[PDB]
Amino acid sequence: GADGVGNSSGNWHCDSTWMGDRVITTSTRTWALPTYNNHLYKQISSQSGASNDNHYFGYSTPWGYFDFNRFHCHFSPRDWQRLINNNWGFRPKRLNFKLFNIQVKEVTQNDGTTTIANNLTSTVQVFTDSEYQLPYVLGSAHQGCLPPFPADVFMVPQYGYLTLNNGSQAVGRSSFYCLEYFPSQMLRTGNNFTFSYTFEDVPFHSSYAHSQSLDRLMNPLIDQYLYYLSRTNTPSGTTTQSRLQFSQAGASDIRDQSRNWLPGPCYRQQRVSKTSADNNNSEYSWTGATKYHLNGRDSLVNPGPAMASHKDDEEKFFPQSGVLIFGKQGSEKTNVDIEKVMITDEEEIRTTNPVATEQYGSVSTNLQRGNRQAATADVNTQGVLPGMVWQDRDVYLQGPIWAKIPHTDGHFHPSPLMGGFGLKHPPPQILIKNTPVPANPSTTFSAAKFASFITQYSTGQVSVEIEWELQKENSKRWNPEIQYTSNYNKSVNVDFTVDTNGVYSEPRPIGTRYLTRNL
Amino acid sequence: GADGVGNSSGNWHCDSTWMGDRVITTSTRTWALPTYNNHLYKQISSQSGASNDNHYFGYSTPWGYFDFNRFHCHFSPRDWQRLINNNWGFRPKRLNFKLFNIQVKEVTQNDGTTTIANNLTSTVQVFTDSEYQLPYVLGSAHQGCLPPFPADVFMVPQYGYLTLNNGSQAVGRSSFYCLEYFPSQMLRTGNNFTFSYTFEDVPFHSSYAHSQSLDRLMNPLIDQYLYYLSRTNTPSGTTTQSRLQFSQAGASDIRDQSRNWLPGPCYRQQRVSKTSADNNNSEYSWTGATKYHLNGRDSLVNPGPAMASHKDDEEKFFPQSGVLIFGKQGSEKTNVDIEKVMITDEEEIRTTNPVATEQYGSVSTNLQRGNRQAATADVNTQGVLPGMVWQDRDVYLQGPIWAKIPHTDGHFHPSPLMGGFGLKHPPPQILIKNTPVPANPSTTFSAAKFASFITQYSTGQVSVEIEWELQKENSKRWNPEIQYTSNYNKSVNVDFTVDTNGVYSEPRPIGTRYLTRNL
Amino acid sequence: GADGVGNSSGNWHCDSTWMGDRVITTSTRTWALPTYNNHLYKQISSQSGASNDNHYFGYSTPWGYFDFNRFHCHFSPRDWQRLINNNWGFRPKRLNFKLFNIQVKEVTQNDGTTTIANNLTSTVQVFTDSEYQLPYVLGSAHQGCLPPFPADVFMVPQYGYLTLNNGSQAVGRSSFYCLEYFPSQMLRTGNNFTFSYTFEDVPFHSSY
Known part of the structure; x- marks a missing residue:
């Protein structure tokens, strides 16, 4: 699309409609984009000394990207509630994206005084990596997606990536991708960039909880006919x-x-309790946490394989890294206290997957005989076995939505571990940069790289609409199901609202399993 | 096909052409075939005493078979190089085979003097077990495939197989297949035997190495939004x-x-080092090697599940049985010294699969509490888990090409462990024998089995052409990829060449992963 | 072409005719071919010490080749004379080649006594490198072309070539071509191999 200067390149679409089987969540937000790395690609690496488990090598780019891999960039409390309360499941089907009403400003810090003004002509160029030739960053639970709350204006994240490294240094195989080596489309004002996508047959996220459970599954009334010891x-x-x-x-x-x-x-996790007391006093944060390790660097095992967070009567506990944890609006970046976070709970699974903190079962060890007692031992790590069945990590409104399945010779059941939909070809990375503006050059020629540009940034709105499919309920369950409700009692502030100083805030994490299906 | 005596039953096709997407490697070689087991099927078994882990029972047959399950029976250094240097991957599609110019000779060892001459009439019969009713031997990394080097004449292997056994003895269920109970086609000279095959949709072997790695995969620039302990x-x-x-x-x-x-x-292997020194002195060759065991006989676990052979900076090490090892042209059969072999290295994987010699991760053991320190333990064997992803063993020019997927109630990801393509219905076994020639019988009748035949063998050439498909590269990687090259510096002998006495020889094993794709 | 055992795969053409503007020199000769390098490719090099101006590195092959890059393999004194006496110049235009009546024998040196006999079946394979992917040896004034005199029987030369070398040793860039990596056509007796060529506009040799 294209047009003039006094012409809105797009309108503001931010609705949400239900069609009984589908439901489309449209949504638009205003954004802003600075000029990163002062226009250059910069090589970046771990800090020489830094623990080995923490080395790295890669680059940062002058490019900023867009992202909405967070459910709340599309659902509004209320809406989400509708969904989550009457649907055995759902999945995404297609999407449509559009940037527009782009505007490029240029600040002027003359002495003690800045002065922003329109640089009409100058441009912002966008381009979508629709061929997945670029290190897929999204899906890495990074933060810089869309604001849950519409009215919120936001800053676009900067693109960076990582290749191979032998400690803080590079190793040859490591590749260096350059973002200009793509055909960016260039927008000036009155220019918009639309594009549309279509998801691939994926499984409806199971948004229901199980009424029966593996063990208690047969009929009481009748004894089997098979005998046991x-x-x-x-x-x-x-x-x-x-x-x-x-x-x-x-x-x-x-x-x-x-x-x-x-x-x-399963893959056993340490148990910690919400009750300060109980917890052994010391530093086993890293030393005691469950992990794995490649090329000699032990990494953490966060969002462990999907497994229930606590047995009956112990909502007080949880895995050291077996759950998802979000911050309460405001919560600072590091070592913040338990009261500042919201920990997710996956009891709902108990019924099929093992409890994170407790061993799978217990296999026999020795072979008994008259002169030898029968051995046995508990198992803390059980890899998939025939006949195993289970449930994947629930979703959470403010959780990830999807993730790219790594291109490998082999995958095994790709539901992303952090939860979400595992996509082979996910929504392509969308990038954006501000074509540089060489500020006043010298009369006499010089073949050096240009280094003095006009200081300026861009802004304008962006819109994303997505169509989701649904699997409606259908149980002959007589007695009432559980539903998600908001507390009746008075409160100084409404949940999912702006405080007195207009600061929107999500009180609690909202899951997805409420409706009850039998196993 | 058919014709006369002074008529070449086939020409010599030994080309190799690239078509951009396909590439056909034709190839012909001259062969020779003796008369095995002096024409009879012989029962065979382990040696009574022999360790239990080494018993067996089965038969050897007068039949010899054909085989080219080695990449170098089709690719020529150079060629292979072409492939291996510009292709994200490739796979086989169809094939065509033909035997021809068959000729039957008959030696005469009269006293101190032999004298070979043409037995024109007598025949050689061939037959392909296209219904897989015969114990598939190929794929067992046996040696008697085609010569890498064309000019080389070769001897055809003899068919033998194995059934059940209770120690050195047979067990009833064990079957005894007789090769005459098939409809062999009989060739005389001027007769040729052609036949063609078509492969089944299989996955392109991944002939690229990964630039990113599981751990280092997200974007540096931005901190996530999920919290951890x-x-x-x-x-x-x-x-x-x-x-x-x-x-x-x-x-x-x-x-x-x-x-x-x-x-x-993973499945932990012992680490040994190319440097004699380091290695503990003793015999843990068997005692310390990783294995598994059926019906009470522990067998070795060679070509362990695909896993990187050494962490950064340790090309000096390797698994006890986690790698493929070929002999340097000439190397004798047993207990040959390290200097006589070529050990393959799979560092290229590090990025996704665990290191063979080092544990997977470490799960937590106990449940901590005030009066109880947090436990933990390393895991040396981790069976497939959801979310796991990995790469299969690379290929190597002189490595296996494929292997038959065993007919079972259940398989799990069939890429053959020794590497190659896992086929459900692989190229059918091709067999060949020389119809016997009863040497002078007695005038007076006798109903005994004939035992005195004319001494004679056969020869003639064989040709095999195969069409392979390719997946071409396509990365926006700016900086140069790695490629496979031959050393510039002078040398007394060219690699993959005949020495001074015309002995072709493969200097090193050549892998397949050189081109670099992101993860 | 193809046929039987008691069938001449080709006749003997050895004429020479003038047409006023053209002139065709046909010519046939009997030949013989041993088995070189006992069937193997052998690496070969200068003699370590040997003056530098004389080092080399290359291979010898079990293959023998054919050659008639000598005018007298086509002209007969007399003929040549005709040409050479009444022509401002001349040049070659096209050619046609054919091998035939191939026969494979097999000697038997039993003690103090050899005995040659027909190995009917066994074959001889031929192939023309029509794509010039092989080190062109001919033109190097080597000797093993055709006999000037028809009646003369001859032995076929063995193919060998040379690559790069840093003294008596090889240098990487040097290539090693293998003759089986071509699609030889296989002849048995009663089999013949014909093929034809066409020269390219070249200048008449100035014969004045």
Whole structure:
């Protein structure tokens, strides 16, 4: 699209409509973009000394990108609630994007006095990496997505990436991608950039919780017909004499019943409690946390494989890195106290996946014989096994929406671990930069790189609309399901509202599983 | 096909052409075939005493088979190089085979003097087991495939197989397949045997190395928004008092960052070093090597599941059985010294799969509390887990090309472990035998089995052409990729050449990953 | 072309005719071919010490080649004379080649006594490097072309070539061409191999 200077390049679309089966969440926000790295690509690396587990090598670019991989960039409390309360599941189908009403300003810091003014002509160029030839950054839970609250103006993030490294230094194989080596489209004012995408058949996120659970799944009333090993030894006057007898598992017997499927896999996490007291006093934050390691650098295992966060009656506990944790609007960056964060809870799964903090089961160790007692041992890490079945990490309104499946020789069940939809070809990276403006050059020629540009930034609005599909409920469940509600009682502030000084804020994390489906 | 005696049953096709997307490697070689087991099927078994882990039972047949399950039976250094240097990947599509110019000779060892001459009439019969009713031997890394070097004449291997066994003895279930119970086609001279095959949709072998790596994958510039557990206890005058505080992972924080996918699986191997010194002195060749075991016989775990062979700066090490090892042209059969072999290296993977010699990660053990320190333990064997992603063993010019997927109730990701393409219905076994020639029988009848045949063998050439598909490169990588080159400096002998006495020889193993794709 | 065992795969053409403007010199000769380097490619180099101006590095092949880059393989004194006496100049235009009546023998040196006999089946394979992907040796004034005199039987030369070298040793850039990496056509007896060529506009040799 194209037009004039006194012509709005696009209108403001920010609705949300439900169609019974679909529902489209349109949404627009105003943004701003500075000139990063003063227009140059800069090489960047870990700090020489820095622990090995923390080295790196890569580049930062003068390019800034766009991102809305956060559910709340599309759903509004209320809306989300609608969804989350009457749908067995849902998934994204297609999207449409558009930047417009772009405007380029140029600040002038003459002595003790700045003065911003329109640089009409100068441009901002955009380009979408629709061929995925660029290090996909999104999906890395970074923060600089869209504001949950419309009215909020925002700054565009700067693109940076990482290649290979042998400590703080580069290794040859590492590649250096240059963003100008693409065909950016250049916008001036009166210019807009639209583009549209279509998702790929993915599974509806399961937005329901299970009423039955693996173990308790058969019918009480009837005993099976298969037998199991009831007792081993037997009374012989005073002493026992080994004599194995078997029984037919019934209701009273349950624990012993024969089955057909196994809980999901696991990778044991340390348990910490919301109650300061209980927790051993010391620094096992890193030392005790569950991790894995590549090329000799141990990394953390955050968002561990999807597994319930606490047994019955222990909402007080949680994994050291088995859950998602968001900050309460305002919460500072580092070492903030428990009271400043919102920890997610995944009890809803208990029913199928193991509890993060407790071992999977316990396999037998030795082979018993008359002169040898029967061994056994608990298992803290069980990789996928036939017959296992499980549930993936719920979603949360202010959580990630999707993530790119890495291009590898092999993947195994790609639901992104941080939760979300695992996409092979996700929404392409959208980039934006401000074509430089060489400030006054010298009369006599010089072949040096230009270094003195006009100080200036851009701004303008952006809009994103997405169509989601739904799987409606359908249970013959007689008694009421659970629903997500807002507290009745009076409060000094409404949840998901602007305070007295107009600061919007999300009180709690809102999950997705409320409706109840049987297993 | 058919014709006369003074008529070449086929010409010599040994080209190789590239078409931009495909590339066909035609190739012909001269061969020779003796008469095995003096024409009879012989029962064969382990040696009574022999360690249990080494028993067996099966048969050897008078039949010899054909095989080219080695990349170099089709690619020529140069060619291979072309491929390997400009292609994100490739795979086989179809093939065509033909035997021809068959000729049957008959030696005469009269006293101190042999004398070979043409037995025109007598025949050689061939037959392809296109229904896979015969124990698929190929794929077992046996040696008797085609000569890498054209000019080389070769001997055809003899077919043998193995069934069940209870120690050195047979067990009933074990089957005994007889090769005459097939409809062999019989060739006399002037007769040729052609046949063609078509591969099945398989995945292009990934012939590229990764520039990013799981851990270092997100964007440096921006800190995430999810929080993790920064510290546990806290300064209380003199003493610490447990007080968990959380932080928002940033660049400096990296190791702690939240992610979305896990390294490939693992099965720990012992580390040995190319440097004699380091290595503990003793015999842990078997005792210390990683293995598994069926029906009480521990077998070795060679070509362990695909996993990088050494961390940064340790090209000197390697798994005890985690790598492929070829002999330097000439190297004898047993206990040959390190200097006689070429060990493959899979550093290229590091980026996704764990290091063979070092544990996967470390899960937590106990549940901590005030009166209990936080436990933890390293994991040396991790079975596939959701979110895991990885790369398969590279290929190597002189490596296997494919392998038959065993007919079972269940497989999991069939890329053959020794590397190659996992095929459900691979190129059918091709067999060949020389119809016997009863040497002079007695005038008076006898119903005994004939035992005195004419001494004779066969020869003639064989040709195999195969069409491979390619996936061309396509990265916006600015700086140069790595390529495979031959050393500039002078040398007494060219690599992949015949020495002074015309002995072709492959200097080093050549992999496949050189081109660099992002993760 | 193809046929049987008791069938001459080609006749003997050895004429020479003048047409006023053209003149065609046909010519046939009998030849023989051993098995070189006992069937293998052998690496070859100057003799370590040997003056520098005389070092080299290259290979010898089990392959033998054909050559008639000598005017007398086509002209007969007399003929040549005709030409040479009444023509301001001349040049070649096209050619046609054919091998035939191929026969493979096999000697038997049993003790103090050899005995040659027909190995009917076995073959001889031929192939023309029509894409010039092989080190062009001919033109190097080598000797093993055709006999000037028809009646003369001859032996076929063996193919060998030279690459780069840093003294008596090889240098990487040097290439090693393998003759089997071509699609040889295989002849058995009763088999013939013909092929034809066409020269390119060149200047008449000034014969005045």
